[PDB]
Design a protein around this nucleic acid. Structure first.
Ligand SMILES: [Zn+2]
Lengths: 118, 154, 215, 128, 60, 84, 101
RNA sequence: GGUACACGAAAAACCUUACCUAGACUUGACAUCCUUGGCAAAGUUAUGGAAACAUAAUGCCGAGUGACAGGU
RNA sequence: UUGUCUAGCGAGACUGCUAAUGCAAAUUGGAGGAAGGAAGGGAUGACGUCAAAUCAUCAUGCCCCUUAUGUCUAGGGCUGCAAACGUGCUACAAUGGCCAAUACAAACAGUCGCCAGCUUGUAAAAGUGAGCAAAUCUGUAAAGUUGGUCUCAGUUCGGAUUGAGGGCUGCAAUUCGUCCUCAUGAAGUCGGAAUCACUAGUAAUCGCGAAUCAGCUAUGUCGCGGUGAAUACGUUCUCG
């Protein structure tokens, strides 16, 4: 479950690359295991790699986040819900304006000639 | 149309004693922040002092003298495909353009840090490389090529 | 598109018309809407009273409505039949706990007060009188009253359609742009059977030099 | 023999004092070293640049208490206070202090943000 | 729908949130100033008439 | 979330739902309250939630609880954009 | 005595109208009462209102008023109850409002 | 178009709101005049309703009448 | 380690004096002075053009409706969406990101409010709770300085979108509140034709206050202060 932690950079960021561990809880793990921040990933003792892996197993599995999010979306969609209906057609959900803006989810662009003004 | 306007007076820099240094410190300025540009310029001067051991004033004056343009191209259109007319440029505008070119070609290069990039810019300008001497020579070549237009012009 | 002349020189050469104060933003709105009912009530009910202006004096449940008119008899009535009615009407429109004790005072040289002149112009216009002769007569009487030049302009239906045919007159030094001029202003809305007629009268009452501040 | 002064650059009033002392001048701003109070730049020399054209810190104590302003406005205020103090010290300094135009209260103060203008001078934009 | 809205404001609402502000001289319910209980244009014309005791013109 | 007694019911539909649950669960009941949240007791019956024009039937399921009862009712129809 | 430190603070919306009143007060109390230090100016707590001109959009042309509020400060070292008895007749106008202690 | 487009709106989840659906009212939610009077008027509590509401009691205001009130 | 300070009055600045040239207004220079030749700024906006905008601030003639185009309530909508334009914010980064320590403002506002201090809380906040009807009490200034780290990469830049958990107002937060914490991290590497604002404490930039308001992705508007530029040879071209 050790997935491509890059070298020539600190461990604090090395734990930010696995899917589900950002800046904050990586620092929480860092302070929990007594690993010293400022150690670059290279020249790191194995003695504490097992500690990192144990405390991460205490957390949520990094590969399990995708499955949990998909299961939650399916749970929200299988029941008749406006949000599920909104989320199904790739249109923003939290209530952002859709008049002109909010194109980060609707796709790059699809231009159509407007009204033929006279 | 308007009339001639006054020009303000710049105080000498009270550590290195040079007004051209003040013009540098004001042209490299952004966000209106002297405490940052001053650190940039004085660290660049320290770098000049360290490598290629030489008084920073001498390098500055050599680079500025080598960069000042002899002629200036000013656009004067008569019809389509407008032609240009070389014009003589005053010494105050000469140093203005020279320092503008130094700063603006300094803030575009490799050697990421602003300190080292501007230090390399000024060193290259002193050593007459293609950093800004090339552009000065290109706009100088653009002059005296249309000199037939320059002789009969307004 | 010019500012009202009465509001421009207000507070620097002319005193406030309603001098009072109260607790901050609590019920000053209530007093502001209640006392103004007296100001509008006079000008609506008593056209012929020729009231020029009224001053409001409120402090902690007391009110003094100063009145300036040319013909106080209409306000007083016959053997004081109307003063009691007007004071009880003011009481009913203001409340019960406030002592009122109003006064009625004469105005010196009324024919140089813009408010009553505009009121007379509105009365003449609504009385089907032709505008030109009535306006000229009022101009003559106000000039003979012993004041400076006048600026009367009247818009509205001048006995027909195409209303944008307003008429204006100027007969003397009337420096609107001068703060130190002591210019009095008023407006009246003549209501003719064909539409709305707006009359505006500017009156100069001499310069106000060496007055220091508001009188 | 204490001497007074007053500078008011950029809505920042500065009270200064002068006294001959055996030391080099004992620079002091608000009972603390100006080398740390002000940002150590040309600005800490802009206060003594009046002294440049005269007897620079011959024997003159610096006791200044200031209010308001940022740090450069403080420098201008204390500069004008110092120049006023020295022109009080010797009426013959009028000729050379006025030559550099170091007195006279440059009075350049921020404007009033006019309505419809972002910064009292700039309109938002123009479009047709 | 102006007189009904004007009289409704005086009537106490069934919830406190339902209460809103509105000027006393005119039925406009927008741009009212709580410090004077009066809309922007009425306040303008009243200050021009001088009814408000504290009024001047600006220099700031 | 209200963060304190967060689960909120309009307090006039609780009586109806309790009575229906205790009275053989008559299938159709008409409510116009979208503000109510469904309690765990809400499961079992149906509602004619008001979308704005008509009464659309919805069948609660223990599959879901706490979703805003009105969230089950769509309010605005589709764009189906006209070409021009 | 029996009422030391009579701190009377007054504010209004005009300068001259308040200056006249404070001069009248400081002169009328200048009888049997003694040691009345002069009026104390105060920052003139001020508020500025901005109102657009036209009933229609016109947003680029708006004027603005400003309801001024001046402020002075009197303090009395000793009440000297005869002095306050004479002080009952100051009869301040409506513009000036006094906040006692 | 310049002179509209972070504008009217210095605050649209309910009210605001002027729109639609539905539930209700008809000298009307508010106003003057006429006659005839003085004991009610705002709020509260169950009860049906989702709420206006119709009930029952608690704690300047009624009744009849037509010109009319009313219209963002 | 006291005469700043706020606010009343007054003085000062008026081509006042001199040199030049002009009949005379007047222009330039110089002395003195804080300001020199309308000292910077504002309010102050003529006759009239656009049959310019507003019957939806208000008033109003006429027309129209009236057991309805009037009134109350519940729910929805002004926030939609294949699209286009305008105005702003965020950015695209080492003139920087993050962390720690740390110094300097004016103005404005507040007894249903400002909320100090203390306790709890990864935080939004909650509880306790003085003080203030205010030059008294409250609204930690940020840019700025130093130290440590990052080493030019779609990254410790950029945060959108999305999932979950909390806290606040409000009867009520799904249609449609914002705040905090955790989770992922879109596009973007300075931008085509063409255009915009700006002549000093201005542009740029960093924060602070107020209105409406129970609360509100106001990044809006109205104000305040800190740092703080570059240029104007000139009217040949361009607009009015
Ligand atoms: Zn109004």
């Amino acid at each position: 479950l050790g997935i491509d932690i890059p070298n020539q950079k600190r461990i604090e960021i090395a734990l930010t690359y696995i899917f589900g561990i950002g800046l904050s809880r990586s620092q929480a793990i860092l302070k929990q295991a007594n690993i010293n921040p400022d150690k670059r990933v290279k020249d790191l003792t194995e003695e504490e790699f097992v500690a990192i892996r144990n405390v991460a197993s205490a957390y949520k599995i990094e590969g399990d986040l995708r499955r949990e999010i998909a299961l939650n979306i399916k749970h929200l969609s299988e029941i008749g819900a406006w949000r599920g209906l909104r989320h199904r057609k790739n249109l923003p959900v939290r209530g952002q304006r859709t008049r002109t803006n909010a194109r980060t989810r609707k796709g790059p662009r699809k231009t159509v000639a407007n009204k033929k003004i006279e | 149309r308007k009339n001639r306007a006054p020009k303000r007076t710049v105080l000498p820099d009270p550590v290195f004693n040079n007004t051209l240094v003040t013009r540098i410190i004001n042209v490299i300025m952004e966000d209106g922040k002297k405490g940052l540009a001053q650190r940039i310029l004085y660290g660049a001067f320290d770098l000049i002092e360290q490598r290629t051991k030489e008084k920073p004033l001498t390098v500055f004056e050599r680079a500025v003298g080598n960069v000042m343009p002899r002629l200036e191209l000013r656009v004067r259109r008569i019809a389509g495909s407008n032609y240009q007319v070389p014009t003589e440029v005053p010494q105050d505008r000469k140093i203005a353009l020279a320092l503008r070119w130094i700063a603006m070609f300094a803030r575009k290069r490799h050697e990421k840090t602003m300190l080292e990039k501007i230090a390399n810019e000024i060193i290259d300008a002193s050593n007459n490389t293609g950093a800004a001497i090339k552009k000065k020579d290109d706009t100088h070549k653009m002059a005296e090529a249309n000199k037939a237009f320059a002789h009969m012009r307004w | 598109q010019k500012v009202n002349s009465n509001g421009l020189r207000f507070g620097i050469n002319k005193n406030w018309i309603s001098r009072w104060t109260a607790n901050s933003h609590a019920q000053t709105a209530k007093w502001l809407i209640e006392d103004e009912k007296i100001r509008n009530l006079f000008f609506v009910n008593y056209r012929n009273a020729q009231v020029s202006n009224v001053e409001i004096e409120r402090t902690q449940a007391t009110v003094d409505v100063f009145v300036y008119a040319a013909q106080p008899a209409f306000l007083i009535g016959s053997e004081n039949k109307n003063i009691q009615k007007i004071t009880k009407q003011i009481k009913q429109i203001i409340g019960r706990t406030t002592n009122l004790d109003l006064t009625i005072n004469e105005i010196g040289s009324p024919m140089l007060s813009a408010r009553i002149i505009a009121r007379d112009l509105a009365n003449a216009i609504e009385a089907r009188v032709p505008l030109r002769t009535a306006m000229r007569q009022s101009l003559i009487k106000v000039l003979k009253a012993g004041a400076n030049g006048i600026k009367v302009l009247v818009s509205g239906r001048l006995n027909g359609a195409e209303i944008a045919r307003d008429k204006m007159y100027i007969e003397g030094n009337m420096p609107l742009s001068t703060l130190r001029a002591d210019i009095d202003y008023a407006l009246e809305k003549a209501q003719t059977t064909y539409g709305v007629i707006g009359v505006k009268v500017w009156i100069n009452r001499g310069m106000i030099y060496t007055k220091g501040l508001n009188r | 023999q204490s001497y007074y002064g007053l500078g008011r650059r950029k809505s920042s009033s500065a009270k200064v004092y002068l006294t001959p002392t055996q030391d080099k001048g004992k620079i002091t701003v608000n009972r603390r070293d100006p080398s740390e109070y002000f940002p150590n730049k040309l600005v800490i020399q802009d206060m003594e640049q009046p002294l440049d054209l005269t007897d620079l810190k011959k024997n003159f104590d610096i006791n200044v208490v200031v209010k308001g302003g940022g740090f450069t406005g403080q420098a201008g205020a204390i500069r004008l206070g110092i120049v006023r103090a020295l022109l009080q010290f010797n009426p013959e300094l009028k000729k050379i202090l006025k030559s550099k135009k170091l007195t006279t209260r440059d009075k350049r103060v921020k404007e009033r943000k006019k309505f419809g203008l972002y910064g009292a001078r700039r309109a938002p934009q123009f479009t047709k | 729908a102006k007189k009904s809205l004007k009289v409704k404001q005086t009537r106490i609402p069934k919830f406190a949130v339902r209460a809103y502000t509105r000027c006393q001289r005119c039925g406009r319910a927008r741009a009212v100033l709580s410090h004077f209980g009066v809309c922007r244009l009425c306040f303008r014309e009243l200050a021009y008439a001088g009814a408000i005791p504290g009024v001047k013109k600006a220099s700031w | 979330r209200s963060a304190k007694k967060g689960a909120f019911v309009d307090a006039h539909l609780l009586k109806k739902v309790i009575d229906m649950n205790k009275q053989e669960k008559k299938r159709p009941i008409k409510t116009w309250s979208r503000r109510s949240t469904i309690f765990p007791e809400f499961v079992g019956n149906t509602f004619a939630v008001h979308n704005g024009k008509t009464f659309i039937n919805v069948y609660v399921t223990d599959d879901m609880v706490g979703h805003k009862l009105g969230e089950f009712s769509p309010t605005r129809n589709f764009k189906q954009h006209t070409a021009n | 005595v029996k009422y030391p430190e009579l701190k009377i603070k007054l504010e209004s919306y005009d300068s001259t109208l308040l200056d006249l009143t404070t001069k009248k007060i400081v002169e009328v109390v200048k009888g049997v009462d003694v040691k009345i230090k002069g009026p104390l100016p105060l920052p003139t707590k001020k508020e500025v209102i901005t109102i657009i001109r036209s009933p229609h959009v016109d947003k680029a042309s708006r004027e603005q008023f400003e309801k001024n509020r001046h402020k002075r400060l009197m303090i009395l070292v000793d009440v000297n109850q005869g002095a306050i008895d004479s002080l009952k007749r100051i009869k301040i106008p409506v513009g000036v409002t006094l906040r006692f202690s």
